[PDB]
Amino acid sequence: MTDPIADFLTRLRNANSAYHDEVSLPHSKLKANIAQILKNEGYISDFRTEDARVGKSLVIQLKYGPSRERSIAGLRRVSKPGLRVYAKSTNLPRVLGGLGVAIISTSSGLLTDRQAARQGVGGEVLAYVW
Amino acid sequence: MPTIQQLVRKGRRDKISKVKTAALKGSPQRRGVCTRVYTTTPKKPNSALRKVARVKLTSQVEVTAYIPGEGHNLQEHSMVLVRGGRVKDLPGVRYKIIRGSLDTQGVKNRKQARSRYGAKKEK
Amino acid sequence: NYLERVVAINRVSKVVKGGRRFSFTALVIVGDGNGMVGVGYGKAKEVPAAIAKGVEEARKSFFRVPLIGGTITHPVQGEAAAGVVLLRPASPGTGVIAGGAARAVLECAGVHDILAKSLGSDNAINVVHATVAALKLLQRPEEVAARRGLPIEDVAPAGM
Amino acid sequence: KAXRAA
Amino acid sequence: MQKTIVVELEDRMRHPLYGKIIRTTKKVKAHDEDSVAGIGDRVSLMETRPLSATKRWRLVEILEKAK
Amino acid sequence: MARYTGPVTRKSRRLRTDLVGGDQAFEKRPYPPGQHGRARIKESEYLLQLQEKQKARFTYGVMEKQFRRYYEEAVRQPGKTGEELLKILESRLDNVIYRAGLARTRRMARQLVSHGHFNVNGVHVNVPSYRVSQYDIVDVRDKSLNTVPFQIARETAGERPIPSWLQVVGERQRVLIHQLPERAQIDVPLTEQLIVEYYSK
Amino acid sequence: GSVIKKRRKRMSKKKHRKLLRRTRVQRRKLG
RNA sequence: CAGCUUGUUGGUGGGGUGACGGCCUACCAAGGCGACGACGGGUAGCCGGCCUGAGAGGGUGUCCGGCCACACUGGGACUGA
RNA sequence: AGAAGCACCGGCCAACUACGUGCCAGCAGCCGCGGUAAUACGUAGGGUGCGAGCGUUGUCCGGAAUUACUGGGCGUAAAGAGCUCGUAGGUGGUUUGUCGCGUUGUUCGUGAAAUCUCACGGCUUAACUGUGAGCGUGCGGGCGAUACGGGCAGACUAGAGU
RNA sequence: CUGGGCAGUAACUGACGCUGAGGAGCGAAAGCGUGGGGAGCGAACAGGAUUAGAUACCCUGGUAGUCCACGCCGUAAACGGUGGGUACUAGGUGUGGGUUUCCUUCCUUGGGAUCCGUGCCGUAGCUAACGCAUUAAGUACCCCGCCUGGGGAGUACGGCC
RNA sequence: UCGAAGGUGGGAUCGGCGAUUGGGACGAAGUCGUAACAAGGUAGCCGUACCGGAAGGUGCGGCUGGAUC
C-alpha cells in the first residue's frame, strides 16, 4: 500500500465513471488542500472535512447536474514515486492550453498553472485534471 | 521493457540489423576475377535460366553474381565490377556485375535505358 | 450539397457450395466544409448501390465539430476499440497533415490547420472510427464553462 | 528422368 | 590504515534521460594526522593536495556521532 | 537549373488550363494533353497536388531545385507558407516586369531581363530570379532605346494591370514597389496549400 | 491448431535425444 | 572475463622533482579495488560540430576550428624558458 | 547564329498504345510478369519526372510507436521464473518541528570563435561571406522560500505484527 | 509429535511494510545410486491373432519398474496457459468457516449486518475478438521477471552443476 | 643498480587447414510407409525412460488447446 494520490484520484475516476454521489476517503493535509484548489477551479462540487472515529475523513461531492454529464473528464498523475518530475517556470506544462490544470508544489505551496506562470516559479508537477 | 528502474538496472538495445554484404567491408563495388559461368535454374514458379558466375573478389572469396542483360562475352575470366542488388529467385545470388565496364562490353542493340547494361548512344 | 470523399474500396467473398459470391463495398464520407460530417460504409454487389447506401448512412449520421476558425480546441487522443490517432490544433497550422483518409475526413470537415498522425492499426476503417472518436471527445470553451464557472479566463489570445 | 528431389 | 580513514561518499544524480533520482556511492581517503572518530559517525571532509594514492580528502569536523 | 525551353501546349493542356497564353488567348482546344488524353483519368492527391506545383513552376518558369529553396524560406517565415511563397515569388524581377506588361510573354520578359534590357537602381543586372524589394527601382537600360520592346511594349502595357503594391512610372518605367507584394490579395490563379502539403510528402 | 506451435519443438527435441542415445558412448563421450 | 591487488595499500624517515605526491627510496603496518561492474578481452583519437529527425533521440566526428598522441620500429638522455 | 540530355512509365508511384515475343528468352525494390492476343520482357511511338545533369550500387537516419523517456507489450497472438523465502538494491503510511541535500526562483561568472535560428548588410542574385541579436538546453559561486521529496530529532495510530 | 490459517476481542509495539536481481530452500510421475521388498499390474521382451507388410492397436504370458529405508538429477499443461502486493468501482444467485442482530421462537436455528475463502451468472468499463468482470483480462501506484518475425534453436562452441 | 633488444622454456588466448563425420537448409514430377487435422479410424498433447529404419509406438503420472454426455 502506497501512493495515496493514486487512490485519491482513482476513487474519483470510479465515481465519475459510475456517477455516484460522493467519495469518502481518509483525511490528510494534501488531500484537503488539493480539494480546495479543485473546488476553486470548479471542476468538483463541494467537499467536507468529516471525522468519523479512527482519524479524520473527507467527502467529495461529484460535480454534475446540467445533465447526467459529469463536469470531470478524467486525470493522470505524472510524478510517480520513482519518477519525480519537477519543472522550471519557463518550461511549465501546457497541457490542454489553459484547460489541463496541473497542480504544482512550489516554494510557496500548491497552485495552478496560470498562477505559477504569473509568479514565475517552478516546482513539482503532481497531476493533471484534463 | 517498462519499469524505469528496470531500465536503469538494465539498459536497452534494438534488434541488430545484419550487415547485408561481404563486399570488402561493404565498399560499394569491387573487382572480381570473374570465373565459372553457370546458367542455373531458379525456384519452381519461374521456369527460366539465369546467367550467373562463381567469381573471386579481392577479399579472396567465391561469390555468386548475376549477369544482367542478354548475351555475354565471358570465358570464366575477364574481370568484372560487382555491385549490389538481389533476385530472390536464385538462392545464393547476392551480387550483380555491371555490363560494359573494365572488361565486359555493354549489351548490344539496346536502345532504352542507355545508362545501364553498358548501353550507349548510337555513336 | 455536400462534399464527397471516398475511401479505397475493398472486396468480400461469401463462399457457397458452388463457389464464391464476390461483393464490393467502400467506406464513403461527406461533409459540408463546416464539421458536419457524415460517415457511411454500405455494401452490395453493385459498387454504386453500396455507395449510395453509404451516402444515406452519412445523411443519417452527422457530428458537429467544435471548430475554431478551421481547427480544433485542444489535442486529442483518438483511441478507439482498435485504432489510435493522436492529433493537435497546430494553432498556426497553415496546412492540414494527417494520414490516409483521415485527411479526407478533414477535407469533409473543412479544416485548414491540423497536425495529426495515425498509430496502431492501419486498417483504414478503424482508423476512421478512431478519428470519429477523437471528434466526439472534443469540446468548446463555453461548454467547459458548463463544467466550471468563470469562463473566458483561459489561454486563447486568438479565438475569433 | 531427376537431378533434384526427383 | 594508520593516519587515514575510509569514508563513504554519498551523493545523488539523475539519469540523463529517464530522470530518476538515484543515489551515488563513492569511497574516499580521509587522511589525517590524528584519528578522532569511530565508525558510523558523520564527518565533514575536504579536498587538499595529494599525499598518497590520490589522498585528497581530509578530516575536518566530527558531527552526529554513531550510537 | 535552366529554362524549360519548349512548347506551352504540352503543359497547359496537361494541367488543363492555359497558364499564360500569349498572342492567342488560348489554343481553343479540348482537354486531352496528348494521344490518349481524351480518356477519363483516375485522380490522386499526388497527381492533383503535383499538377498544382507544376502550375506554379511553369507560371513563373522556375525549376524545382530553386523552388525548394524558396519553399524553405517560406517555411522559415511566419504566416501562411503558401502566401509567403507567392509573395517571395512576386519579388522576382521577371514577375514584376511581366505584371507591368512590358513584354508579349513572360518568356519574352525573362529574355529581355536576362539580356539586361531592364537594369536596376544602379546595376546592369541579368538575373530573372533577382529578389526585388521595396524601393528597388528598375532602370530601363539606355542601350535598350531605339529598339522595339520598350516603346511598343509601353504602348501595349495595358494588357497587364499594374500590381496594387507597386507603381510603374511608364515615362521611365521605374517599377517602384511601395508595399509588400501581396499577390495573395490579388490575381491568384491556382492553389498554394496543396503545394505546401505536397512538399511535406 | 495452436498445437502446431508445439509440434516443431517436439520433433526437434526428439531428433536431438535420439541422436545422443545413438551416442552416449566413446562415439561422443571421448569428445 | 568476477576475484583483482605486495611498490599493491598506509605510515615514518630520506632523497628527488619546476612541484604536493610510495614520483623514488630504507624501515615499519596489512591493507586497497570490486556486481553503485575489479582484473581482462574486443572495438575506437576526443570535442565544437556534420547528417538525419517534429523533437526527444539516432548516426557520425570527414573539411574548417580547438584539444590529445605518433614521426622507419623500439629504448634513453642532453641542451634548453 | 553556337550549346540537351538522362531515367522511368501494371500497382504501390506522375508516368501508355501498338509492334515483336511466346514459362523461352528475359525483367524485378515487395507483390511479381512471360505456358502464341505480355499496358510488367525487346523495339517504335506516346506520355511523365528532372535537367548538364540524370540514373544505378553502397552507407546512415527517418519513415519503424518493429527497443517504444516522451512513446509499445506479456489471458490464447513470442513473452509471468515450477513455488516460496530472503540478502544487496528499489520502494516505503498519519504527523510536529528541524537541515535545505534534491528541486524551484534570483544574481554573478561560466558556457570561445566559426557553424545553427532570426534580423540587417555586401559580393550584379544566389550559394557564400559579413554585422548584430538569439541560441549556447548546461556547471560553479552568491542570494531567498520551503511546498513536495530526502536526512536528522520526535510523536500518534488505522498499516503490518504480537 | 508438529506446522499453518480464519473470526471476534483490540491487551502490546508504533511503520518494524511490500517486492526482491544475484543467492538459498521445497518441489508429482518417470529416471538414477546403495540396499530391502516384490501380490497384482506392466515399458522392454516372447509368442499368437490382424494386416500386402505391422518390430503398433487386439489376446496370452512376462523382465525392469511401481512399493519401503537413505541419497542424486531438479524437469512437465510444475496452467487459472493470468507474478506479487496495495486501494477503489452494478448487482444477483449458490457454497464453506465463524461472529453477531429482527422475526427470539416466527424454530429458523430462518432473514439481515460483518470478515475471509469458494463456484456461477451478470451492470459499467476493458478487450482484436473470444471473453473478463469485487477472486478483473476494469480504474491506478510500487517492485520483480520475460520477449521484440519464423526456422536454423532454447541446439552448437564455451562454462557451471 | 636500473634497463632495451634478443634468447631459452612452458603456459594462456584468438584464428585458419584438416581426411573423416554428424546434423541443418534448399531444390517440376524420386523410392517404402501414412503418424497429424473429423472420435483422422488406437483421441491428441507436455515431461520422463525403453524399442524400432521412418513417420512413431509403448508404460507410470499430468492437462484439456479432447469423444459420448
TrEMBL record, chain A:
Keyword annotations from UniProtKB, A to Z: Ribonucleoprotein, Ribosomal protein, RNA-binding, rRNA-binding
GO molecular-function term, one example from the UniProt record: structural constituent of ribosome
Superkingdom assignment: Bacteria
A Gene Ontology cellular-component term: cytoplasm
Alphabetical list of Pfam families matching this protein: Ribosomal_S8
GO terms classed as biological process: translation
Function per UniProt: One of the primary rRNA binding proteins, it binds directly to 16S rRNA central domain where it helps coordinate assembly of the platform of the 30S subunit.
Assembly, per entry: Part of the 30S ribosomal subunit. Contacts proteins S5 and S12.
Homology family: Belongs to the universal ribosomal protein uS8 family.
Protein name in UniProt: Small ribosomal subunit protein uS8
Organism from which the protein derives: Mycobacterium tuberculosis
UniProtKB/TrEMBL annotation, chain C:
KW Ribonucleoprotein (keyword) present: yes
Domain notes: The N-terminal domain interacts with the head of the 30S subunit; the C-terminal domain interacts with the body and contacts protein S4. The interaction surface between S4 and S5 is involved in control of translational fidelity.
Described function: With S4 and S12 plays an important role in translational accuracy.
One GO MF term attached to the UniProt entry: structural constituent of ribosome
Range covered out of full length: 41 to 200 of 220
Protein name: Small ribosomal subunit protein uS5
TM ranges: none
Organism: Mycobacterium tuberculosis
Entry GO CC: cytoplasm; small ribosomal subunit
Keyword Zinc in record: no
Source superkingdom: Bacteria
Subunit architecture: Part of the 30S ribosomal subunit. Contacts proteins S4 and S8.
Domain S5 DRBM: 2-65
Biological process according to GO: ribosome biogenesis; translation
Recorded name of the encoding gene: rpsE
Family (UniProt): Belongs to the universal ribosomal protein uS5 family.
Sorted UniProt keywords: Ribonucleoprotein, Ribosomal protein, RNA-binding, rRNA-binding
Taxon lineage: Bacteria, Bacillati, Actinomycetota, Actinomycetes, Mycobacteriales
From TrEMBL, chain E:
Subunit annotation: Part of the 30S ribosomal subunit.
Family the UniProt entry places it in: Belongs to the universal ribosomal protein uS17 family.
Function: One of the primary rRNA binding proteins, it binds specifically to the 5'-end of 16S ribosomal RNA.
Organism: Mycobacterium tuberculosis
Source domain of life: Bacteria
Phylogenetic classification of the source organism: Bacteria, Bacillati, Actinomycetota, Actinomycetes, Mycobacteriales
UniProt protein name: Small ribosomal subunit protein uS17
UniProtKB/TrEMBL annotation, chain F:
A molecular function (GO) term: rRNA binding
A UniProt-annotated Pfam family: Ribosomal_S4
One record GO biological process: ribosomal small subunit biogenesis
Keywords, comma-separated and alphabetical: Ribonucleoprotein, Ribosomal protein, RNA-binding, rRNA-binding
Residue span(s) of domain RNA-binding S4: 91-153
GO cellular component: small ribosomal subunit
Residue ranges constituting the Small ribosomal subunit protein uS4 N-terminal domain according to the UniProt record: 3-90
InterPro entries (UniProt xref): Ribosomal_uS4, Ribosomal_uS4_bac-type, Ribosomal_uS4_CS, Ribosomal_uS4_N, S4_RNA-bd, S4_RNA-bd_sf
Family: Belongs to the universal ribosomal protein uS4 family.
NCBIfam families xrefs: PRK05327.1, rpsD_bact
Biological function: One of the primary rRNA binding proteins, it binds directly to 16S rRNA where it nucleates assembly of the body of the 30S subunit.
Quaternary structure annotation from Swiss-Prot or TrEMBL: Part of the 30S ribosomal subunit. Contacts protein S5. The interaction surface between S4 and S5 is involved in control of translational fidelity.
Protein name: Small ribosomal subunit protein uS4
Organism expressing this protein natively: Mycobacterium tuberculosis
Gene: rpsD
